[PDB]
Design an enzyme around this catalytic site. Sequence first.
Site, PDB file in Angstrom:
ATOM      1  N   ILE A 275      -9.170  -0.010  -2.035  1.00 28.60           N
ATOM      2  CA  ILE A 275      -7.884  -0.780  -1.303  1.00 28.60           C
ATOM      3  C   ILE A 275      -8.008  -2.450  -1.778  1.00 28.60           C
ATOM      4  CG2 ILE A 275      -6.887  -1.575   0.870  1.00 28.60           C
ATOM      5  CD1 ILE A 275      -7.945   1.337   1.734  1.00 28.60           C
ATOM      6  N   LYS A 276      -9.284  -2.914  -1.293  1.00 27.47           N
ATOM      7  CA  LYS A 276      -9.546  -4.246  -1.808  1.00 27.47           C
ATOM      8  C   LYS A 276      -9.610  -4.543  -2.999  1.00 27.47           C
ATOM      9  CE  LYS A 276     -13.066  -3.455   1.158  1.00 27.47           C
ATOM     10  NZ  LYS A 276     -14.370  -3.741   1.781  1.00 27.47           N
ATOM     11  N   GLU A 277     -10.108  -3.579  -3.964  1.00 20.87           N
ATOM     12  CA  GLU A 277     -10.167  -3.740  -5.496  1.00 20.87           C
ATOM     13  C   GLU A 277      -8.706  -4.341  -5.887  1.00 20.87           C
ATOM     14  OE1 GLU A 277     -10.204  -1.093  -9.519  1.00 20.87           O
ATOM     15  OE2 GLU A 277     -12.139  -1.410  -8.209  1.00 20.87           O
TER      16      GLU A 277
ATOM     17  N   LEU B   5       0.864  -1.358  -0.248  1.00 19.85           N
ATOM     18  CA  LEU B   5       0.050  -0.021   0.056  1.00 19.85           C
ATOM     19  C   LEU B   5       1.034   1.308  -0.002  1.00 19.85           C
ATOM     20  CD1 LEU B   5      -2.842   1.056   0.295  1.00 19.85           C
ATOM     21  CD2 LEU B   5      -2.083   1.265   2.761  1.00 19.85           C
TER      22      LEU B   5
ATOM     23  N   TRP C  79       2.559  18.538  -9.978  1.00 20.19           N
ATOM     24  CA  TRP C  79       3.594  17.991 -10.108  1.00 20.19           C
ATOM     25  C   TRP C  79       3.853  16.813 -11.174  1.00 20.19           C
ATOM     26  CZ3 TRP C  79       3.991  13.032  -8.075  1.00 20.19           C
ATOM     27  CH2 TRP C  79       3.031  12.623  -7.419  1.00 20.19           C
TER      28      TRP C  79
ATOM     29  N   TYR D  71       6.186  12.231   3.996  1.00 18.94           N
ATOM     30  CA  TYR D  71       4.806  12.546   3.491  1.00 18.94           C
ATOM     31  C   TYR D  71       3.981  12.891   4.520  1.00 18.94           C
ATOM     32  CZ  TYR D  71       6.143   8.858  -0.184  1.00 18.94           C
ATOM     33  OH  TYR D  71       6.836   8.232  -1.187  1.00 18.94           O
TER      34      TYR D  71
ATOM     35  N   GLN E 195      13.333   1.834  -6.459  1.00 18.13           N
ATOM     36  CA  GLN E 195      11.799   1.804  -6.356  1.00 18.13           C
ATOM     37  C   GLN E 195      11.920   3.122  -7.483  1.00 18.13           C
ATOM     38  OE1 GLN E 195       8.491   4.399  -3.757  1.00 18.13           O
ATOM     39  NE2 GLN E 195       9.308   2.361  -2.876  1.00 18.13           N
TER      40      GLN E 195
HETATM   41  N1  LIG Z   1      10.026   6.935  -4.146  1.00 13.98           N
HETATM   42  C1  LIG Z   1       9.267   7.893  -5.195  1.00 13.98           C
HETATM   43  O1  LIG Z   1       9.804   8.799  -5.801  1.00 13.98           O
HETATM   44  C2  LIG Z   1       7.981   7.753  -5.348  1.00 13.98           C
HETATM   45  C3  LIG Z   1       7.072   8.819  -6.095  1.00 13.98           C
HETATM   46  C4  LIG Z   1       5.649   8.877  -6.056  1.00 13.98           C
HETATM   47  C5  LIG Z   1       4.995   7.805  -5.319  1.00 13.98           C
HETATM   48  N2  LIG Z   1       5.765   6.875  -4.328  1.00 13.98           N
HETATM   49  C6  LIG Z   1       5.207   5.921  -3.628  1.00 13.98           C
HETATM   50  O2  LIG Z   1       4.421   5.089  -4.497  1.00 13.98           O
HETATM   51  C7  LIG Z   1       2.995   5.031  -3.982  1.00 13.98           C
HETATM   52  C8  LIG Z   1       1.840   4.994  -5.291  1.00 13.98           C
HETATM   53  O3  LIG Z   1       2.042   6.002  -6.107  1.00 13.98           O
HETATM   54  P1  LIG Z   1       1.231   7.426  -6.395  1.00 13.98           P
HETATM   55  O4  LIG Z   1       0.403   7.444  -5.120  1.00 13.98           O
HETATM   56  O5  LIG Z   1       1.925   8.205  -6.942  1.00 13.98           O
HETATM   57  O6  LIG Z   1       0.112   6.745  -7.341  1.00 13.98           O
HETATM   58  P2  LIG Z   1      -0.720   5.640  -7.849  1.00 13.98           P
HETATM   59  O7  LIG Z   1      -0.842   4.476  -6.809  1.00 13.98           O
HETATM   60  O8  LIG Z   1      -0.425   5.299  -9.143  1.00 13.98           O
HETATM   61  O9  LIG Z   1      -2.293   6.225  -7.981  1.00 13.98           O
HETATM   62  C9  LIG Z   1      -2.972   6.696  -7.023  1.00 13.98           C
HETATM   63  C10 LIG Z   1      -4.221   7.264  -7.286  1.00 13.98           C
HETATM   64  O10 LIG Z   1      -5.112   6.419  -7.701  1.00 13.98           O
HETATM   65  C11 LIG Z   1      -6.346   6.392  -7.242  1.00 13.98           C
HETATM   66  N3  LIG Z   1      -6.595   4.812  -7.331  1.00 13.98           N
HETATM   67  C12 LIG Z   1      -6.155   3.932  -6.425  1.00 13.98           C
HETATM   68  N4  LIG Z   1      -6.903   2.438  -6.796  1.00 13.98           N
HETATM   69  C13 LIG Z   1      -7.726   2.816  -7.804  1.00 13.98           C
HETATM   70  C14 LIG Z   1      -8.528   1.980  -8.540  1.00 13.98           C
HETATM   71  N5  LIG Z   1      -8.772   0.833  -8.505  1.00 13.98           N
HETATM   72  N6  LIG Z   1      -9.111   2.675  -9.532  1.00 13.98           N
HETATM   73  C15 LIG Z   1      -8.836   4.056  -9.678  1.00 13.98           C
HETATM   74  N7  LIG Z   1      -8.164   4.789  -9.051  1.00 13.98           N
HETATM   75  C16 LIG Z   1      -7.351   4.468  -8.062  1.00 13.98           C
HETATM   76  C17 LIG Z   1      -5.999   6.936  -5.623  1.00 13.98           C
HETATM   77  O11 LIG Z   1      -7.305   7.601  -5.206  1.00 13.98           O
HETATM   78  P3  LIG Z   1      -7.994   6.941  -3.980  1.00 13.98           P
HETATM   79  O12 LIG Z   1      -6.855   7.052  -2.822  1.00 13.98           O
HETATM   80  O13 LIG Z   1      -9.235   7.967  -3.780  1.00 13.98           O
HETATM   81  O14 LIG Z   1      -8.405   5.622  -4.267  1.00 13.98           O
HETATM   82  C18 LIG Z   1      -5.018   7.925  -6.234  1.00 13.98           C
HETATM   83  O15 LIG Z   1      -5.410   9.264  -6.621  1.00 13.98           O
HETATM   84  C19 LIG Z   1       2.770   6.315  -3.435  1.00 13.98           C
HETATM   85  O16 LIG Z   1       1.495   6.497  -2.837  1.00 13.98           O
HETATM   86  C20 LIG Z   1       4.241   6.232  -2.621  1.00 13.98           C
HETATM   87  O17 LIG Z   1       4.076   5.278  -1.114  1.00 13.98           O
HETATM   88  C21 LIG Z   1       7.130   6.820  -4.726  1.00 13.98           C
HETATM   89  C1  LIG Z   2       7.677  20.718  -4.541  1.00 16.06           C
HETATM   90  C2  LIG Z   2       6.367  20.027  -4.773  1.00 16.06           C
HETATM   91  O1  LIG Z   2       5.696  20.799  -5.409  1.00 16.06           O
HETATM   92  C3  LIG Z   2       6.072  18.709  -3.932  1.00 16.06           C
HETATM   93  C4  LIG Z   2       4.489  18.557  -3.888  1.00 16.06           C
HETATM   94  C5  LIG Z   2       4.457  17.166  -4.141  1.00 16.06           C
HETATM   95  C6  LIG Z   2       5.707  16.597  -3.829  1.00 16.06           C
HETATM   96  C7  LIG Z   2       5.976  15.178  -4.441  1.00 16.06           C
HETATM   97  C8  LIG Z   2       5.096  13.997  -3.815  1.00 16.06           C
HETATM   98  C9  LIG Z   2       5.196  12.596  -4.313  1.00 16.06           C
HETATM   99  C10 LIG Z   2       6.662  12.207  -3.851  1.00 16.06           C
HETATM  100  C11 LIG Z   2       7.072  10.983  -3.293  1.00 16.06           C
HETATM  101  C12 LIG Z   2       8.394  10.624  -3.098  1.00 16.06           C
HETATM  102  O2  LIG Z   2       8.626   9.616  -2.353  1.00 16.06           O
HETATM  103  C13 LIG Z   2       9.593  11.623  -3.598  1.00 16.06           C
HETATM  104  C14 LIG Z   2       9.343  12.937  -4.103  1.00 16.06           C
HETATM  105  C15 LIG Z   2       7.668  13.118  -4.624  1.00 16.06           C
HETATM  106  C16 LIG Z   2       7.900  12.963  -6.230  1.00 16.06           C
HETATM  107  C17 LIG Z   2       7.541  14.804  -4.095  1.00 16.06           C
HETATM  108  C18 LIG Z   2       8.552  15.721  -4.792  1.00 16.06           C
HETATM  109  C19 LIG Z   2       8.127  17.265  -4.317  1.00 16.06           C
HETATM  110  C20 LIG Z   2       6.471  17.452  -4.711  1.00 16.06           C
HETATM  111  C21 LIG Z   2       6.390  17.557  -6.179  1.00 16.06           C
END
Ligand SMILES: NC(=O)c1ccc[n+]([C@@H]2O[C@H](COP(=O)([O-])OP(=O)(O)OC[C@H]3O[C@@H](n4cnc5c(N)ncnc54)[C@H](OP(=O)(O)O)[C@@H]3O)[C@@H](O)[C@H]2O)c1
Ligand SMILES: CC(=O)[C@H]1CC[C@H]2[C@@H]3CCC4=CC(=O)CC[C@]4(C)[C@H]3CC[C@]12C
Length: 325
Positions: free
Chosen positions: A279-281, A22, A229, A57, A192
């Site tokens: 979440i469950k889906e 998650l 972003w 976060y 990641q």
């Molecule tokens: N390490 C990095 O640089 C980095 C960067 C970005 C993200 N991450 C990590 O990756 C995780 C996942 O990515 P992300 O949050 O960017 O995106 P994502 O998981 O690709 O998409 C999330 C979006 O999709 C919706 N969603 C979830 N399940 C859905 C479904 N079955 N049908 C339609 N919409 C659905 C969510 O809304 P609801 O919540 O309303 O369901 C939310 O708006 C983050 O939360 C974080 O833990 C890491």
């Molecule tokens: C500076 C700014 O606007 C912030 C708001 C949202 C933020 C992002 C939120 C999601 C995220 C998750 C990570 O683990 C790494 C950085 C990123 C990719 C963040 C980078 C900085 C951002 C783009």
Amino acid sequence: DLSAASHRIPLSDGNSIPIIGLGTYSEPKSTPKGACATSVKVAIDTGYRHIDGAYIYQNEHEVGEAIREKIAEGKVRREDIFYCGKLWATNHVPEMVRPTLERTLRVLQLDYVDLYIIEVPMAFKPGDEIYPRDENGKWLYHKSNLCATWEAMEACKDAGLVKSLGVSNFNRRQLELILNKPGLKHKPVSNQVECHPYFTQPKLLKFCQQHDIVITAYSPLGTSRNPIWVNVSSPPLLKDALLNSLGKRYNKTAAQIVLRFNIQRGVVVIPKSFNLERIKENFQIFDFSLTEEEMKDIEALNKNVRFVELLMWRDHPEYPFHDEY
Ligand SMILES: NC(=O)c1ccc[n+]([C@@H]2O[C@H](COP(=O)([O-])OP(=O)(O)OC[C@H]3O[C@@H](n4cnc5c(N)ncnc54)[C@H](OP(=O)(O)O)[C@@H]3O)[C@@H](O)[C@H]2O)c1
Ligand SMILES: CC(=O)[C@H]1CC[C@H]2[C@@H]3CCC4=CC(=O)CC[C@]4(C)[C@H]3CC[C@]12C
């Protein structure tokens, strides 16, 4: 092979990671307090055994609250839970690594994290502010030294504060930097990166596989598509014709189709959802599998366009997205 009750894949260091987890990032201002905690609890009940979070976060305490509550009631033992935390750009100075991990441990109120990764290969000005920007709104960077920061990460594993070490947003060059580091103790076991049908990461995936590095697909559903972003040049992934067409065939949503796609290819996915039903889906992806022909047609959807470009940091020396992979 993989099932709802058993879907952990091995890591190079002898550990294992649940193939689905998650994600917990949610826009601070527009997110109800306690929403993250409730979601983690629901996820654990649904069958998730992997949670991906980050101190930046701003909800890491909610994540810990939920995990501790589930361990307290006997739903899971600490060993059944896998949590991944991240080291932000403003904490890359060697002497700051361990204290930064310890803070996360104190926020979670846990003895260790299953995985700790360098959040980005770029280093920002060390400080309280996570986004160092001077008067002119200009970004205050800092000279990176991945090898040195990595050595500090290794010390954390040696102290028993974390079981596995990894990275995030690292390109082939930056990964080689660590892999070829003189006297390397602990090799990164995971990278990641953004990964989904529109950005399949074909070359970075094969490189990682050559070194036994497992890829974790962040934004596996194409991101929340927030314009602040996210690069929205590409249409909504979940509206894709083929993905929805395939969904009809298995009576699964496009989201379920894209998740199955990545786990079937050995890619860990961390879809984020604070919605009970979604979440469950997202967890219902073990009761079917895609054919090789479908896997190929899905992979063929790759556009090579990132939803997460972070252009505002393209000038930083360690910007990873300039190189091919
Ligand atoms: N390490 C990095 O640089 C980095 C960067 C970005 C993200 N991450 C990590 O990756 C995780 C996942 O990515 P992300 O949050 O960017 O995106 P994502 O998981 O690709 O998409 C999330 C979006 O999709 C919706 N969603 C979830 N399940 C859905 C479904 N079955 N049908 C339609 N919409 C659905 C969510 O809304 P609801 O919540 O309303 O369901 C939310 O708006 C983050 O939360 C974080 O833990 C890491
Ligand atoms: C500076 C700014 O606007 C912030 C708001 C949202 C933020 C992002 C939120 C999601 C995220 C998750 C990570 O683990 C790494 C950085 C990123 C990719 C963040 C980078 C900085 C951002 C783009």
